[PDB]
Structure formats: C-alpha cells, structure tokens
Amino acid sequence: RRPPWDIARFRPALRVAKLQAPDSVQRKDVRSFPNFQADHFYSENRDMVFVMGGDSQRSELRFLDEWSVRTSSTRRMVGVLTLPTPLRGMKHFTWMQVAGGSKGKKPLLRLSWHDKREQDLRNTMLATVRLNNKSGDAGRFKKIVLGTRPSGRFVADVRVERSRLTVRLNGRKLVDEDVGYWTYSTNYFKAGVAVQEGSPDARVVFHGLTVS
Ligand SMILES: O=C(O)[C@H]1O[C@@H](O[C@H]2[C@H](O)[C@H](O)[C@H](O[C@H]3[C@H](O)[C@H](O)[C@H](O[C@H]4[C@H](O)[C@H](O)[C@H](O[C@H]5[C@H](O)[C@H](O)[C@H](O)O[C@@H]5C(=O)O)O[C@@H]4C(=O)O)O[C@@H]3C(=O)O)O[C@@H]2C(=O)O)[C@@H](O)[C@@H](O)[C@@H]1O
C-alpha cells in the first residue's frame, strides 16, 4: 500500500480537495497529499482506496470548489470505481455526492449502495435527489433506482449546469432533473466512502477520479 499521491492520475483531483475523516483518525481535514497514507486512505493496485466503518463515519474527499446549480460553467465529476462486495453488517454508505454546503445544509444528491431497499431490492444502488432541504418527515425526495451493484468497475459521471442535474452510469443517463428550485449557492462534490449505517468497514476503490 502506498500514498495515493504517488499515482499521478489522481493528482489533479487531490490538488483541489481535502480528505475528511473522523476526529479520532485525523486532527485536521488532510490538505497536503504527498507521502500521506493511513488505513482509511491508501493506494493498492494503482487505485485510490477509501475505507471507513461505523454509522456516520466517513473517509471522503471534500472538493473545495463551491457553486450554485444555475452555473453556466459545467461542474462535473467522473469516477471509474469498484464497490467490492460489502461485509455483512454494512447497510448503507454513499460513494459520491453533491453536498449542499453551509446554505443548502443537506446534499442535493447522494449516490449510495444499500443491502436492502423497497421500491424488494437487494444489493442495489440509489440516486437520491432532494426536492427540498428539510429534515425528518418534512423532507421530499426523488429516489431513482440505479440497479444492482456492478461486480467489477463502472463509470459514474455527475454534471450540473443551468439548473439541470444529471448522472450517467456507464454512459446511460439514469438521472436527469431540473434542480432550479435548489437555490443555494454553496454546493460542491465529494467522493469516497461516507457510511450512513454499518459497523463493519466499507471500502470504495477508485481507478480514476477527475472533477472539472
Ligand atoms: O436512508 C435514510 O435514512 C435517509 O437518508 C437521507 O439522506 C440523509 C443521509 O442518510 C445522511 O444523514 C446525510 O447526512 C449529511 C448531513 O445532512 C450534512 O448535509 C453533512 O454535511 C457535512 C458535509 O458533507 C461536510 O463534511 C461539512 O464539512 C464541514 C464540517 O464542519 C467539517 O468539520 C469540516 O472541517 O469543514 C466542513 C466544510 O468543509 O465545510 O459538514 C457537513 C455537516 O453538516 O457536518 O453531510 C452528511 C453526509 O454524510 O452526506 O443527510 C442525508 C439527507 O438528505 O438528509 C435521505 O436520503 C432520506 O430519504 C432517507 O430516508
């Protein structure tokens, strides 16, 4: 295992993100990558690997650029990645998002993996598009099934511009939504592993990741 920063094709994305993980694992969000590796963030097989367990706990890049949905310049994140079979006890983790930041509060989008959902689906991937930024019973969502977890790599490609949000998975446009009601100006991408519910370690393996 070696520092991810050793793999040059990860450097452009590393230069415009910081790595968030729990307070127990890191004093400060990581901003300097050369030489850095830990159990939660390392490179094996030339890939950049995030590993975290515990509900709410994350090992996730937080991209520093912040924008509104109305933006004329595309914001886009594309990842080539593998979700290895999760361990029994791992229920729900998020491997890409559009975070709503300080004004939005809640994520506009989460791309997540789930042991079980009903919409009876097992081992299934979800895009959740928030219809408002509200908590608990008051929140409204569009939940878009993304299908079964690929057993090997796949490509996820998230875009927003001019109030349109899309997500392509291996080229197929599975999410295509007007997000103009989401007026907040503090959105930004993240990628990695953020565990919603699960005690065992989840691991998310990136073969490439670029933002633009
Ligand atoms: O299945 C279900 O149970 C339901 O899921 C519902 O989606 C929920 C999720 O399950 C998660 O609870 C999700 O949690 C969000 C949380 O609501 C915030 O939006 C949070 O935002 C954190 C940011 O990502 C970022 O880390 C930010 O960093 C600050 C921080 O102060 C930090 O210390 C650092 O130093 O500096 C930064 C910064 O850089 O700005 O903190 C934000 C924070 O509030 O802590 O992100 C989590 C997350 O994991 O994404 O919320 C969603 C949701 O939509 O509410 C929903 O799908 C529902 O249908 C299901 O039934």
Residue numbers in the entry: 27 to 145, 149 to 241
Q: Which of the paper's sentences describe this entry?
A:
In heterotrophic bacteria that use alginates as crucial nutrients, alginate lyases depolymerize alginate into alginate oligosaccharides (AOSs) and then into monomers for assimilation into the central metabolism. The overall structures of these PL7 alginate lyases are similar, showing a β-jelly roll fold composed of two antiparallel β-sheets with a deep cleft. The noteworthy structural differences among the solved PL7 structures are the loops around the deep cleft, which are variable in length and sequence and involved in alginate substrate binding with the deep cleft. Structural study on several PL7 alginate lyases reveals that two loops around the substrate binding cleft determine product distribution.
In addition, it was reported that the PL7 alginate lyase PyAly also shows substrate specificity for polyM. For the product generated by PyAly, the trisaccharide content was approximately 21.9% whereas the tetrasaccharide content was 44.8%, making tetrasaccharides the main product. The structures of the PyAlyH125A-M8 complex and the PyAlyH125A_Y223A-M5 complex were solved at 1.62 Å and 1.70 Å, respectively. Through structure alignment between the PyAlyH125A-M8 complex and the PyAlyH125A_Y223A-M5 complex, the overall sugar binding profile from subsites -3 to +3 is presented in Fig. 2e. +1 subsite: The side chain of Arg84 formed two hydrogen bonds with the C-5 carboxyl group, and the side chain of Gln123 formed one hydrogen bond with the C-5 carboxyl group. +2 subsite: The side chain of Gln46 formed one hydrogen bond with the hydroxyl group at the C-2 position. +3 subsite: The side chain of Arg88 formed two hydrogen bonds with the C-5 carboxyl group, and the side chain of Lys44 formed one hydrogen bond with the C-5 carboxyl group. Interestingly, although the bound oligomeric substrates for PyAly and A1-II’ had different chemical structures, their three-dimensional orientations were similar.
